């Protein structure tokens, strides 16, 4: 099923010929365009007052990474390395060993944030909800090295943003 | 001498006054300029050389030039007319003192005039660049990279082997 977009024929009678002559000599459609711009001039603009106002987001929003804990304070990560194996950009480095109490914990957990593509595959792969993408997106730096996160920085991010991370997970975990 | 030096750029910028004032026409000065990359490589090699602990080095170029010939070559590479005239020592000192009152970087100073019109010492008893594995680069191979910026549009594309190197007072 198809239609033509430019297959029409103008009328040849004296009335329409004079109408088109008047359009040519008196600039009717140009006046119409001026009127459209004039009407837009009197509308309310769509601008928001950043940073005092923010653009809307959703609980699924994928931002800065963080490592989480259990309510007891123990880390959720168990050094399974599923996130490292699934990372499409090879942005995760993990080293582990038995802890002094025999636990299975990481000794190195690094994320290169200049390699990361912020796809969220790591938090889909994680079986214990240890690594998440938080809601933060305003973490621009002044040096390249400040964007190479180690375990301490990620644990600090988790401790800093848990109050919102848990709420965002609660509102969406039933879709997963 | 180099791209950001105060040696070749200093003499090239003298064209703005119209003539080049030279004490005794620059006929009683001998200069031995050295390339910047040679100096940097020599510093690196001194760091990496264990035998150079308490040593003292003198980094000098492969040729010695009279000041007049050096300035003439500088102006020839820049394709600017050369109009040298002799200025007495006290008049030049007066001009330097006049320029010294600039709160910004002075164009010239009395000390700069003194150091420009003084010959380079010869210290054969000190080790040099060749004792650190560096072969000194002649000025004739690197002067265009500094002086092409000082040319006009008509002469911007002239090649390196055009400007006929100057005479050196060697040995």
């Amino acid at each position: 099923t198809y239609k033509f977009v430019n297959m029409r024929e103008p009328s040849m009678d004296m009335k329409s010929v004079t109408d088109r002559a008047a359009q040519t000599l008196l600039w009717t459609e140009l006046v119409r365009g001026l009127g459209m711009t004039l009407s837009y001039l009197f509308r309310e603009p769509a601008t928001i007052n950043y940073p005092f106002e923010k653009g809307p987001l959703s609980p699924r929003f994928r931002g800065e990474h963080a490592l989480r804990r259990y309510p007891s304070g123990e880390e959720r990560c168990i050094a399974c390395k599923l996130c490292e194996a699934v990372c499409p950009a090879q942005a995760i480095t993990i080293e582990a060993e038995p802890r002094a109490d025999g636990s299975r914990r990481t000794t190195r957990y690094d994320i290169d944030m200049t390699k990361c593509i912020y796809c969220g595959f790591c938090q889909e792969a994680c079986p214990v909800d240890a690594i998440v993408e938080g809601p933060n997106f305003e973490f621009s730096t002044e040096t390249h090295e400040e964007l190479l996160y180690n375990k301490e920085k990620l644990l600090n991010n988790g401790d800093k943003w848990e109050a919102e991370i848990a709420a965002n997970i609660q509102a969406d975990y039933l879709y997963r | 001498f180099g791209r950001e030096d105060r040696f070749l750029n200093y003499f090239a910028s003298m064209r703005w006054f119209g003539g080049v004032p030279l004490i005794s026409l620059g006929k009683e000065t001998v200069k031995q300029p050295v390339y910047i990359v040679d100096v940097s490589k020599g510093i690196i090699n001194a760091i990496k050389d264990p035998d150079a602990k308490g040593k003292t080095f003198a980094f000098v170029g492969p040729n010695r030039y009279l000041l007049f010939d050096l300035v003439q070559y500088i102006f020839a590479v820049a394709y600017r007319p050369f109009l040298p005239y002799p200025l007495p020592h006290f008049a030049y000192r007066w001009v330097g003192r006049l320029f010294e009152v600039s709160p910004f970087e002075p164009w010239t100073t009395r000390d700069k005039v003194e150091r420009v019109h003084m010959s380079d010492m010869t210290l054969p008893h000190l080790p040099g660049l060749e004792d650190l594995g560096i072969q000194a680069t002649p000025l004739e191979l690197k002067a265009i990279e500094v002086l092409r910026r000082h040319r006009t549009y008509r002469w911007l594309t002239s090649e390196m082997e055009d400007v006929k190197p100057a005479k050196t007072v060697n040995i």
């Binding site: 140009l30 365009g33 711009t37 837009y40 001039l41 603009p45 601008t47 | 549009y153 911007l156």
Partner: protein, 318 residues
């Protein structure tokens, strides 16, 4: 006391140009469903000051391939001519009273093109040269029609004195006697000032920055100032020519207020036109000016020569 008059003529015009930049930005923004400058200064009132201070504290560049003498001459000529073309305008009293003021405006406006020509040529770059050639083409397109329109309109004035236009339009605006000539004159003034849809010398999407692509900082700022001063001056000339304000010798302030209001309206209409339309092709402008405007202008010149003789309405002051 004459120098005081020159200063009080030239400084306020520069201030008006500086704030016309902000007014243009805000009008375009609100026509585009946004706001425009509203952060630096209340309602962006300090934006022009910041722009000027930033431009004049920035490094100006001397192109290696450029011809420095004309490279520096051209913006000086542009700004000086833009400032000069204000002196014979009666508001209601001219700073310089000329027998032939209109011819003076014609001559200096035709001289103003050489600033663009010489800046583009002395830049010694390809986009600048293309901009300068487009300037040549634009002048060839509009000049003759502009002159004939001016003569046809002034046939009812009786002279080339700009003050007589006040007494000619004491009872009725000249818009009600020569509105086709006024439409053609408005389009010709849009073309004369290189304004959209005829902003071809710059050609932002076509020529990057056009004739002033090599210019930076203060020399670029001077070209901008000359451009906007020409905009305001041309609209003031149009207002005096076709919308004649009433003058009372004992209260010229009323005339000044009315004339400034009309000029501001015309300038805002210029900005509106820029915001509303696409850009011409620079041969289409030549064809429009030579195939549509020129025959109509010749016929209307014949009509406006014949009409005063036919109706015994010949103006005085031979």
């Amino acid at each position: 006391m004459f120098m005081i008059n020159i200063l009080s003529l030239i400084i306020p015009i520069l201030l008006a140009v500086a704030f016309l930049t902000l007014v243009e930005r805000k009008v375009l923004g609100y026509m585009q469903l946004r706001k425009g400058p509203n952060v630096v200064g209340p309602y962006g009132l300090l934006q022009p000051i910041a722009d000027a201070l930033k431009l004049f504290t920035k490094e100006p560049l001397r192109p290696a391939t450029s011809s420095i003498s004309m490279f520096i001459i051209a913006p000086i000529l542009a700004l000086s001519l833009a400032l000069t073309m204000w002196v014979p305008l009666p508001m209601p009293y001219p700073l310089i009273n000329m027998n032939l003021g209109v011819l003076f405006m014609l001559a200096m406006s035709s001289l103003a093109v050489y600033s663009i020509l010489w800046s583009g040529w002395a830049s010694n770059s390809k986009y600048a040269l293309i901009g300068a050639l487009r300037a040549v083409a634009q002048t060839i397109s509009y000049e003759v029609t502009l002159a004939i329109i001016l003569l046809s309109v002034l046939l009812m004035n009786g002279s080339y004195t700009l003050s007589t236009l006040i007494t000619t339009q004491e009872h009725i605006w000249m818009i009600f006697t020569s509105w086709p000539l006024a439409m053609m004159w408005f389009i010709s003034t849009l073309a004369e000032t290189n304004r959209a849809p005829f902003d071809l010398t710059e050609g932002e999407s076509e020529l990057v920055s056009g004739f002033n692509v090599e210019y930076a900082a203060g020399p670029f700022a001077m070209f901008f100032m000359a451009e906007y001063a020409n905009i305001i001056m041309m609209n003031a000339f149009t207002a005096i020519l076709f919308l004649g304000a009433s003058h009372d010798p004992h209260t010229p302030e009323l005339y000044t207020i009315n004339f400034v209001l009309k000029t501001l309206a015309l300038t805002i209409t210029f900005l509106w036109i820029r915001a509303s339309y696409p850009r011409f092709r620079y041969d289409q402008l030549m064809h429009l000016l030579w195939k549509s405007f020129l025959p109509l202008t010749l016929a209307l010149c014949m009509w406006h020569i014949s009409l005063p003789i036919m109706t015994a309405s010949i103006p005085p002051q031979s």
